Every structure is written in C-alpha cells, then in structure tokens.
Amino acid sequence: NWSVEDIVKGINSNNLESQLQATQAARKLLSREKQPPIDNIIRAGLIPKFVSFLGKTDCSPIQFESAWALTNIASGTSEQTKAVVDGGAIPAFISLLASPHAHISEQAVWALGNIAGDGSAFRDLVIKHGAIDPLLALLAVPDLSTLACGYLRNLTWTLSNLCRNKNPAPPLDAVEQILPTLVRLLHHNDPEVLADSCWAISYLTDGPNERIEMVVKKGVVPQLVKLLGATELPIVTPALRAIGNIVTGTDEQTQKVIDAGALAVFPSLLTNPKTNIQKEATWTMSNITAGRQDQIQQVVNHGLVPFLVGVLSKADFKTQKEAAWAITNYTSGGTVEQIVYLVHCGIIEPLMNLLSAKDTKIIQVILDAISNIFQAAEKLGETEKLSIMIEECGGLDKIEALQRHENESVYKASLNLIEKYFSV
Amino acid sequence: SQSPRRRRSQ
Numbered sequence: 001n002w003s004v005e006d007i008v009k010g011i012n013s014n015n016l017e018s019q020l021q022a023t024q025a026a027r028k029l030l031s032r033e034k035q036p037p038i039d040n041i042i043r044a045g046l047i048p049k050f051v052s053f054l055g056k057t058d059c060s061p062i063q064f065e066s067a068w069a070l071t072n073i074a075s076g077t078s079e080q081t082k083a084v085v086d087g088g089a090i091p092a093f094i095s096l097l098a099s100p101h102a103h104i105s106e107q108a109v110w111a112l113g114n115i116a117g118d119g120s121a122f123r124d125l126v127i128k129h130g131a132i133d134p135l136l137a138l139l140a141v142p143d144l145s146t147l148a149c150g151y152l153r154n155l156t157w158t159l160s161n162l163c164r165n166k167n168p169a170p171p172l173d174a175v176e177q178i179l180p181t182l183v184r185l186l187h188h189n190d191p192e193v194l195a196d197s198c199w200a201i202s203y204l205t206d207g208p209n210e211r212i213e214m215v216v217k218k219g220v221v222p223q224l225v226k227l228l229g230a231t232e233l234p235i236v237t238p239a240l241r242a243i244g245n246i247v248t249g250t251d252e253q254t255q256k257v258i259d260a261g262a263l264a265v266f267p268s269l270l271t272n273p274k275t276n277i278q279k280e281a282t283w284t285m286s287n288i289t290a291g292r293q294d295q296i297q298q299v300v301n302h303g304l305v306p307f308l309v310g311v312l313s314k315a316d317f318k319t320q321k322e323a324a325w326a327i328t329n330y331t332s333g334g335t336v337e338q339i340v341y342l343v344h345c346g347i348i349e350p351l352m353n354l355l356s357a358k359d360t361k362i363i364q365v366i367l368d369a370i371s372n373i374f375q376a377a378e379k380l381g382e383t384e385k386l387s388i389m390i391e392e393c394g395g396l397d398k399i400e401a402l403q404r405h406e407n408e409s410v411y412k413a414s415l416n417l418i419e420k421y422f423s424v
Numbered sequence: 425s426q427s428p429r430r431r432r433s434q
Contacts, residue, residue, distance in 0.1 A: 031431075031432060031433050031434060032433070036431070068432060071431075072431045072432060075429045075430060075431035075432075076429070076431075081429075107432075110430070110432065113430070114428075114429050114430065117428030118428070118429075157430070161428060164425075164428065196426075199426055202425075203425075
C-alpha cells in the first residue's frame, strides 16, 4: 500500500499517531506474501525507530505494530536478522514478554524465536540477555490447556529454537532450565505443540551421550515411543529422529528405548510409504544391531529380521545402504545362532544383488558382512555350504569381479574372500 | 529439520 518513502516521512514526523499509522503501513508491506521489501525497509534506516517504538508502553498499538514489523524483518536472511539484533532489539523484545497485552507478548515470543533460530551465536545471545526466565514464566500455569492455543504453539516453537543448533550446542544450564517445561509440552494434546516439542527433544539428543542422558533421565522415552506411533507424519518424523539419536548413545540408553516398546512399531516404520521415515527407521535399526547380543535377540524376537531383509531387497538406495550397515553390525556382534537365523531369513540373495552398486562404501560394508557370516560358518563347519549359496545366486561372479576394483579395501577383502572360501 | 524462521503473513 504505502511507499517506503511515505513510511519514512510518517516515522520521522515526531507525531506519535502519525508514527503509529506509518508503522502499521510498514507492517502490512512486510506481511504481504509476494517478496516483502525487507532490504528497502532496512536501507531506509527504519529498524532503530521500530526498536524505540517497542518501548512505548503508553501506546501499546505501536509496540505491537513495531514488534510485528521487526518479527518479519528477522524472518529473512542472516544479514536481515543481524540488522534487527544490531538495532538493539533483543533486550527490548525480552522486556515485552511481560506486557499485559497477550498479543504483544506473543509477538515478542515470535520475534525472539526468529532471532534465536538464526544460529548458535544469536541463540546464545538471546540466552545471555535473559530470555529463558520470562519465557518459562508464561507457561507456569497448572494446566497448559488454559492457555490460548496459538499462544502456546508460538512459545513451544520459540523454545525449540533455543534448543536448536550445534557448534556449540546450547549451554548445559539453559537446557536443564528448559527441560521440565519441554517435558510438559511433549505431553500436551495439540498436534502442533507435540511436533515442535519432539523437534526440540531431537535437537537436545543430537549430541554426546551426556546430552542424551540429560533428556533420558527426565523419563521422556515412553512418550517418545507413543508419539512414534502417531498417525500424523509431522509428529512421527521428529519422534523417530529423537529415538534414532538416543540409540547412538550407550547400550543402556538404547535399552530404555527397547524397554519402552519401540521395536513393536518398526514393522510399520520399516515399510512406511514415506522414504525418509524408512531411511531413518533403518538407520535407527543399524544402531540397535550395533548393541549387545541380548539387544540383537530382541530385534530377532520382535520379528524384525525379515523386515531388514525386505528393505535390503527393495527400498530407496539410501535406505538400502542403511540396511547393509544394519546387517554388518548384526553379523559383527551377533552369536553364531543369530547369524544362522539371519541366513535362514534370506539375507544372502539381496546382499549379493547389492554388490552391483556403484557406491564404494556399500560394497565394503557388504563384503565385511559376508566375512562375518563366513566366520560364523567356520565355527560351525558349513563354510562350503555357504559358498554354494553365494554361488547359486550369482554372488561368486561379483566378489570375483571386485578384486580388480579401484578401491584398496575392496580389492583386498574380495580377494581374501575368494582365496579362503572359493578355492581347491 | 523444520524451518528455523517464520514470517507472520496474517
């Protein structure tokens, strides 16, 4: 509607009502779907004026309009977000969290979410300015259901950004301060609150075992497993990420996931029509089969080996690569009986067919698993029985062709295989 | 991961 030129004229008028009308006009310009003129507004020098309007407690309308305008500037590129921070906006927005007007405090929540979402530095800067205490105070009600639903979703999303990003991860004391509120939100019945809570938990568990432990010790794994079975893709996706993260930790952290019943949802996850769900579920499997023999046994007992055979047989190639890793981890740590069971489920033929892949890493992984299965066969005396199985499905052709392959590890291992199990 | 930034188009 208005031109930037006219907005500037109104803002510079030193007439509060004229300034309000011009700030609202800026807000509407910045709120249009078609390429908002953010850089034009910044170049006109308006950010410092918007920031000063955030402090006009006597004129809450101009606080709201300035907050909205600045929110949308901070929603753009890093350099645009930086312009808002450089104008002094962080402490001004934190001051607005205590506004008696819900729509104004909500806009400050939103703006701080955008600023913290830029990256690690601005996230930690929002924290150093003291955003966490007043953010959490807005949620200190006995039942979250009494809060307005849009208000609650905005607070959850902003808290999730305070949990987001690495190098560095969020300060340990900030995480520990936020976590109990996060756990409340993870048990709330709104699907958008649930999704962003799950995302927050997935960020917190994307790191070293000490960070996983701080989440797992709050008892959220059962709720994560429940959400793993949700019908809403926007909930299953972060729930699976968080579960996947947790099983990259210690065998005891992985056991909590198994204890909570996660493996029973993997028949559905490993056949999920959404390829990134299948991929992440198979990746998660590969870190469970890297565990203890008793954890491999629970994978067996839940009937999941046929599902791994399936994904190896037919899936998106990235998923098939995760399955190859799941099998190599299984054969690396499993008992002889567990490895025998894997052959009886049909692993050999799909394993052999993937030796035709161009990818050099997957060849080594598959060759490594064939090795581990042969070592199981040696312990039993059936090395030749296995060599005919690999022969019958056209496998021997592939290991044979592979000793003349560019890779050192591929040529060495494939030749070692030919020499030890396919000779006179 | 989801979008770190949200514009209010309202």
